[model samples]
Structures are given as structure tokens and as C-alpha cells.
Target: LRPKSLDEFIGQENVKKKLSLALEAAKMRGEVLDHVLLAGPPGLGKTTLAHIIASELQTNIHVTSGPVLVKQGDMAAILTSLERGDVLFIDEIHRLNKAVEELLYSAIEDFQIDIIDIQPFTLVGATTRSGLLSSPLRSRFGIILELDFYTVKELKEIIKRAASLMDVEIEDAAAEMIAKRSRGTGRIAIRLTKRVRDMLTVVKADRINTDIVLKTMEVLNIDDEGLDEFDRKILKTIIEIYRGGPVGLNALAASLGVEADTLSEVYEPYLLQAGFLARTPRGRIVTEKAYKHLKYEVP
Candidate 1:
């Protein structure tokens, strides 16, 4: 329902189809819609989808979340004041307080939450990780939808779409070439287009032409799998630290003298997805493939 009206929502057809059917049922029954919980990785548009819902339904959204709702009174103020069918977008719903999270069930399920002192109204939550949210609170969503990552096809489509939106005439060959190495994420593809574009247009304007995509790529050091600077470091570190065997993530981070959070959040996902690093029960293990990518022979 929301996506039917959203301009930029993409790659979640299953979710959209289910929501559309439910919306028709809600309209015929003249009932407030069920609460929706969108979960996924960052920049996958869990936030954008929430806004789309508000736009599609012509309802205003109230933004708050687990961390923002400091007290019971906080959620109470947002909920009780909501006009019928308002979308209360709770970002980072996983961090919700137990009292406040539990208190949310009745409102979502019955359109009435007991604030332990007050009332409740319509709610929607956006979370990066559904696993972190409480069960009871999780149950209340009535519709828990995980936003999956974009495929190569989807990522390319978004890149083309964004390029068109920006009114830039990126060559289809150039676009396809970039899409093939986009690491299955629109965020990276869009970023790469500009990065490569900058190198061609501003840095070496006279020397660049249509063939500059290949030349710029070689100079930028983007691997066939699109591993960039820090991504390579983590993989290199694991190989050097543990001789490509399993090593604890904390130990690797400590040895590299980087924050564990940085390695985990920023580098590991790409490395793991690219097949250069594997996450084991003990820690991270560099694959032989990773050693080869780094041009280092395996022991």
C-alpha cells in the first residue's frame, strides 16, 4: 500500500504485495491497519518505507524510538495525541524499554495501549535487527517484514533510476559495468558512479572519454569484487594475524589497533559477503581467496 505510492521504494515486491492485500481488507472492513515492523540493514530504506506509508495513507508521522522515549510519559504523549490512523514511526525499536515495549502490544493489536496510566494509539516501528527486539513487543507488530538486501539487478536498477533522477547521462555500458561490481548494494553503486565520475571529469578532464571508466577503475584499485581500502585491511589483518586460520575478532581488532566496532560494522560485512573472510564461532578466518586478492601467497 505504502510502496504503491512511494516514488523510490524498490526490490521488496513480496512485502509490497502482502501489504496491498491487507490494505484493501482494512479499507473494506473500515478498521485501522495493523502495525507494521520493517527490519533490515542500514540504508536499505526501512526509514524511507515508513515515510512512504505515511505519504500513501495521507497521514502524518510522529518520529520517536526506544532511546528517544525516555519514559512511559514519552510514548504516552505521542500515542494519546495521535489522530486516528496516524503513523508513529519508532526508529531503532529494538532498544525499547521493557515497560514501554510491553505496554505497546495492546495498542498495536487492539489500537489501545495501557500506558500503565494512560491510553494508546496506532504505532509502527523500524528496526535494523529484528533479533534484538523483545518477543512480546515483536509479536505485537502483526506484520513483521524483513527488508532484504538489493540484488545485483535491483542495485543496478536503483543506480539507473537515481542517475535518471539526477539528470546525468551515464552510459548504459558504463552503468552496467559499474553495476557488475557494485557489491550488491545501491549505496555503493551510487557512490562509485560519482567517485569514478569525479576522477574522469574533474581530475583528468581532457584525458578522459567513454573508455575512461575502465582506466579510472584500474587507478582507483577497486577489485573485481569491489573491496575498498579498509575492507582489504581487515582481510589482510586476519591473514597476517592468524595465518589465515580462525582468530577472535577482538584479538584481530586489538592487533590492528582499530576499534572492534569499526572492524565489525564497517569492514566485516563487506568482507564476509565478498567471500574473503569467514566469521566462525571463534572469530574471523581469512580465506585463501583473500590472500590471493591481497597478492600474498598462502602459507
Candidate 2:
């Protein structure tokens, strides 16, 4: 479930404070909130925050994705339809085609339509690949906020909140177990809670405890470090086959028979952030931590 107000929104304290202030100012001025770029990993509540922005501003929200706005006309249609103070929330915005992105530049920065006057509306672009966005496009955003991973404490709070909302009984230790294994994402934490709830019902149990949590996680095969099977595969490939190499992305992807783009965009970010992998000008190198986690000798 999404939180309507800034205070109710879990974590992202700094972003919430700054964004709320901007919304308040825009409301006072009877104008639209500025163009904003929300960059972060997936499942970190970017979409929820976008809705919150519109709700706080007391305006309408139009949701779309970068891939969906393939043609220039599609982008133009959405832009022209937005009223004053409206929020256009674009998810995975970094994936927008060049033509669509170019059209957005004028609309966001200058607000100068072909011949129309000022269009007072907000463009809230969310992206997991901030690096993919051209500098020219990125510069148009008045607010560029990066959503970081939630701390264990914050994740615990989120678990408790979600449990209460779902009318499920979970002890604090069980909540902590799920929080720690959730990879610092509320989306994952909530999903785990629901899955565990299902398991509990299967056994005619009403309460969640550490044993249930551990057994559920074991059945799910989620590691203590929050690494999944594919994550371990990537690490194992790097260490065992490549000898902990600075292997090229394509080569690594070929070895796994997966998409190179998927490997880079989906998997690498969390691995890199967690010190399981490192990137250099040449290629990817598995960290000693990754080897240790995978039980490979780090020679």
C-alpha cells in the first residue's frame, strides 16, 4: 500500500523533507512542482513517491513508462493533455528513445510548446539507470533525488507496518529476519510477508515467528546476504570460471546465456553496492567478499 502523506512515507527522510517543501512552495505559488528526476534501484518506492507528490500538491497524476512513449507523438499527446499543476510520472525514464527524450527536453526545460505559451505542469521522471540519461536531459530537472537502500531498522518498521495493515501477527524477531533478508526494499519485504502469511495459513498457524521466517526463507532459497540464485551464479562464474576476472560484460553474459543488458542493469547495481563486485575501465571483477560468500578461495 502507498502512503499518501510525506510523514507516512517510510524512509527517504531527506528526499521527503526536500520534496514536501517544494510541493508546499508550489502550492503557495499556485504553480506546478518543478521537473524532478527520481533515480534509484527498483522496488525502492519511486512510483509510490510519484503518487505522493501529486497527492501532496493536490493535483492529478498521469503515469507512463519510457518504453511506452516510443514515438514523439505519444510523448506530445501526454504533454498536451496535462493541465496546470498536473504531474506526469514516467517510470524507467532512462529507457526513452532518443526522439522522445529530445522532445521532452523542450517541454521540461523551456515549457515552450510549438507555439503555445507556458505549460505549468510537473515532469517526474523515475529511472534505475541514471547514467543512461543524457546530461542535457538530466540538467532540466530542478530536483534530482536518489533513493538509497533502506536501513535494517527502517525495513523492520516497514515490515511491522505492513503486518499491521494486513492484520497479520508477526513477532519482532521474525520481522527483523524478514527485514534483513528483504534486500533493503519495502516491496520485497511486503512480498515476503504475504508469502509467509500464505505459508502460515497452510499450516493452520496465525502467528509468525523466527522459525517460520527461517523455514520460509530456506524454502525460498534466499541467502542470508539477500543474494538470490542468479546472483550466486554470477559470482560463481566470475570466480570459478574467470578466475575472479575482469571479464567483459558480453562474455560474462554469454557464459550464463543471459542478456548483457539485464546483467548490467538488473543485477550489477546491487552486487556493486554490496561490495560483491567492482567495475573498472576494463571490465567486472568479483570482490573478495563475493568469493567468501560463494565459498570460493580468494587467491
Candidate 3:
């Protein structure tokens, strides 16, 4: 799943260009890469980009997530452990506690965290929601880049590439079909391809084609929009049960038998990105688009 180089990295042309030049400049100057904030919807390859950055800089990478950094001392240990020119790749950085996040300011700026010793290294922070990041923390990033959803064309190319790597034969049309329904996400595209391959292997099919792709998706119970069972449940609950929602998160999660955090972090973002759901000041709201997709009349 890791792209060895920027050339191997698919999509995000705009980000690739600037980041490439920056890395080149850093190498030329024999300096460490600067802090970067990569914010976007999940599965858009922010974590992949973090590794690519480390590779481009010819540096080691230390990976961790927001919830794991419980205290300032914990953050200090992670930062101090990095070698010079290494990359600290923090995924879901918006969830970091304020105390821990505050320590990053001086770490990125001065290569020191309180009394702890540190190496000069790149801080690559990935987040699904940039809005959750505080301005002070956001301002410390030398580069702030947003990774958008991959287009269907790009996703098809990605599917073909992954298929080639895995020695699977797939028709262009089948790849396109999967790509179109993948919600412009790389993670979904690859996972869906593997799932389809599993079905093919189960029946011992010779090759993958459009009919197989469609049937595989149908058997998986995924919608045309590439939504799984849970995603549809979120929309249906909001539309049919809550009367098109201005509904609160806890109540919705209670109805669905999942945690509020799971709904927001896993399902809600994509639904909002797809324009099937909205987050209002009041609460979650199902859009008319959702009703059309579900074939249910909006109240």
C-alpha cells in the first residue's frame, strides 16, 4: 500500500508539486524538512503521504496517533526519540490533548520540548478535520496542504496499479465501475478490489469484469454510492426515524447501537463529504440528496 516514491504516488498533483520542490530545496541546503499539516477526509492517503515525505527526505519516520499521546511527557519522549532529519508522523492529530499539543510549538520551532532534548526533524501531522485543530497549533506548521478525494479516473488507475501488483486480471470497465462507486477514496478502492478478488477466488473465476464487479458489490451489500450497511443505517435513521434530523449525536448513536465517536469519526465525515448528510449548529441533518439515494420521500 506504500508508494515508494512521489512518482508512484497517485493523485494530489498540486500537493505533490509543491512538496517535491520543498524536499528538493531542503536536500540541497542539507536542512531538515519543515512541519506540514496534511488535512483531508480519511482514506485519502495522508498517512501514505507522510511516509512519502520521509522517503523523499531520506529520513526515518516515527509513527503514532493522537489518542496515544496522553501527556506532555509522553509527547516529549516521542519527539526526543527522533533522529535529526527524521519525520514524526502523527495521525488524527486533532484529537491530541491541548496540553500535549501545546508542547509541539516549541518542539517544531526550537527543536526543544521543555527541558527535554530533541532532534531537528519534520513534523507531518495528518487530520481528518482541520477545523478541530486550534489556530495556535495550526499556525506552527510550515506547510499546510489539504488532500482531496481522488477522482474516478485516478481511482481506476490506482485499481489497475494495485491489481497489477497483486497479479490479478481486471477489465478496464470493471476497474472504472469500482472506481466510480468508491466514493473517490483509495482505501475503499483497494479494499473493494481485494474483496472482489476473494469472491472471484471462491467461485474460481478466470478474470474480473464489470458483471463480476457489480455482483461482488451487490453480494457485499454495498450501495451504488459505495456505502456499507452502517453508512446507510446512519442516513436511514436520520431520515425515516428522526424525521430528517436536527438530531443530536448521542441519540443517533443510541438508535444505531454504536458510540457517538464512532459515528462522527467513521461514518459522518464521508456522508457529509458526499452531501448526503450535514452538521448544523443544532445537530446532524439528513439532506434531500440522502432521501433520493435511499428512495425515501423527505418529510
Best by lDDT: 3
Top-TM-score structure, candidate number: 2
Error of 3 at 73 (Å): 3.1
> Over the stretch 1-299, how does candidate 2's per-residue lDDT look in tens digits?
77888889889887888888888898898877888889888888889999988998888899999889988888888888888888999998888998888888778766766625446789999998677788888888889888888988998999889889988899999999999888778888989888877777777777999888877888888889878789889999988898888999999999999999788877887888889999987789999898788887769
Worst 10 residues of 1 by lDDT: 113-122
Candidate that beats the other on lDDT, 2 or 3, i.e. the better one? 3
lDDT of 1 by residue, 96-168 (tens): 8866766565556555665433233346788766776777787777777787667777766776666665545
- The residue pairs in collision within model 3 are none
Cα deviation at 78, candidate 2, in Å, is 0.8
lDDT for each candidate structure: 0.70, 0.86, 0.87
Model 3 residue 240 lDDT? Answer: 79
Best to worst by lDDT, what's the order? 3, 2, 1
Lowest summed lDDT over 10 consecutive residues: which window, candidate 2?
A: 110-119
The estimated TM-scores of all candidates read 0.80, 0.94, 0.93
Q: Could you tell me the lDDT of residue 79 within candidate 1?
A: 72
lDDT of 3 by residue, 107-217 (tens): 876787774768888989998777768888888888888888888999999999888877789999999989988887899999899888887788788888887898899
